Amino acid sequence: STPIQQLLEHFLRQLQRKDPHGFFAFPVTDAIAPGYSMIIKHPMDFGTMKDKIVANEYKSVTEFKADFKLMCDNAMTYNRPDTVYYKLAKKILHAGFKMMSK
């Protein structure tokens, strides 16, 4: 486990605590979100991010932050503003970037 992986695993646990219901925990399927694979070209979720840390696939916090922002941007694109998913995505994107930029 490198010092960079450890940093990223710490950031991921803290980000996942902001999603207590697990809405971002695993990939969104078309069965639960009709037309999702048509609308969202580059899906992302926390479980995929955790796997990428473990695989040593992030070179920097910067590349980690981009996967987090992609996850949140996808939820704000697919879901209408007045939904629980849109609201959480907008909220945790802002609070998560602030947390990582302290």
């Binding site: 979100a33 009709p34 697919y78 879901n79 209408r80 939904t83 998913y85």
Partner: peptide
Amino acid sequence: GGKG
């Protein structure tokens, strides 16, 4: 719409 979306997830309902």
